[PDB]
Symmetry: C3
Subunit: 124 residues, 3 copies
C-alpha cells in the first residue's frame, strides 16, 4: 500500500491521496476540473470533462499504470443533460476493452463542478 503523488494533477490537500496502490490495483480519488495549480477550469461539460480526464491520466501514469488499464469508473454528473458531451469526451481517453461504468446525476459536487470521476485500474 503506497500513496501516489504527482504535480501533474491537483495536489491532495486533506485526508486523502490522489490514488493508492494496493493488492494489484490502483484506486484513484474522484477527479474534478482543476488544473494542477489548483485553479478551477470552467466551461460546458466538454471542457470540464477534458480536464477531469487529463487528471486521471496524470494520476494513473504517476502510479505506473494508465488509462488503458482502467477496469472500473464511477461517474457523477451535476446534470444528466450533460451526459452526451461527457460521454463524447470520455470516449476519447478509454480503449477497448473499455472499463465497467456506473453513471448518475447527484445533487451537487465539490466546488459546484459539473463532473467528478473516480476509477480503479490494474497496476503493473
Amino acid at each position: 500500500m503506497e500513496a501516489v503523488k504527482t504535480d501533474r494533477a491537483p495536489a491532495a490537500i486533506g485526508p486523502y491521496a490522489q490514488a493508492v496502490k494496493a493488492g494489484g490495483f490502483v484506486f484513484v480519488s474522484g477527479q474534478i476540473p482543476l488544473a494542477p495549480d489548483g485553479s478551477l477550469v470552467e466551461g460546458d461539460i466538454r471542457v470540464q470533462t477534458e480536464r477531469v480526464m487529463e487528471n486521471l491520466k496524470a494520476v494513473l501514469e504517476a502510479a505506473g499504470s494508465g488509462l488503458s488499464r482502467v477496469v472500473q469508473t464511477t461517474c457523477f454528473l451535476a446534470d444528466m443533460e450533460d451526459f452526451p458531451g461527457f460521454n463524447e469526451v470520455y470516449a476519447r481517453y478509454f480503449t477497448p476493452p473499455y472499463p465497467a461504468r456506473a453513471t448518475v446525476a447527484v445533487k451537487a459536487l465539490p466546488r459546484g463542478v459539473r463532473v467528478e470521476v473516480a476509477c480503479v485500474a490494474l497496476a503493473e
Copy 2:
C-alpha cells in the same frame, strides 16, 4: 483484462463494457431496467428492480461468475421511498454471505430510470 460480452443483457453501446474480468475480480457496469433488446421496462420499483437483477445475473454468468459470488454492490435509487420494494426483489437474488452494500437516492439516473446497480464479484 477482459471485457464480458453477452446478448442476454443490454449490449454495451458506447465507451464501456458490460463488465471486465481483472485481478481475480469482475467489475460489473451499472445495470438499469432494459431488456436485452434495448427496450425500456417501465413499472414500479419491483418490476424495474427485477429487470436490473436479471441483467446482473446474465452479465455475471457470462463472466464465468455469478450472483452468489458478488462481494459488493452500489445501489442508486431515484427515490428513497422505493427502498422497500427495491430491497424485497434484491433479497431474492442474493445469498449468504450477502454482498457488502451502499444504497443512495440520487438526482437522476440514465434514461429516467428509477434504479441502477453496479457490483463487484469474485472471478472463479
Copy 3:
C-alpha cells in the same frame, strides 16, 4: 469469500453483510449514524460523521484489518455544506498514506441521515 459480523456496529438486518472478506480485500457496507443497538445518533455532521467512523472502525477490525488499511472510500453527504465538518472528523481516523476518496452530495440517504461512508480495505 466470508461475511464479517460484529456487535460493535449496527447489525446487518437484511440482504447484506456489514462487510465481505474476499480476494485479499475487505468490502465494507455503507455505514450511517446508527449506534450498535440500532438507535439513530442525531446532531450536526460532526456528531453523525463520528458515529459512522466508529462503525467503519469496528467492522474493519472485526474483519482482521483497520482504518489504516483502507485504500478507498466513497462518501455520500446529504448537503455539501456539511463537508467541512465531515472532513474534520474524517481526518481524525485516517492516516498517511490516506485512502483514495470520492465525495458527493446526493438527494437522500437511508433514514434521512446526513452521511454515509463505504470503503474498501486491504485484509491483514
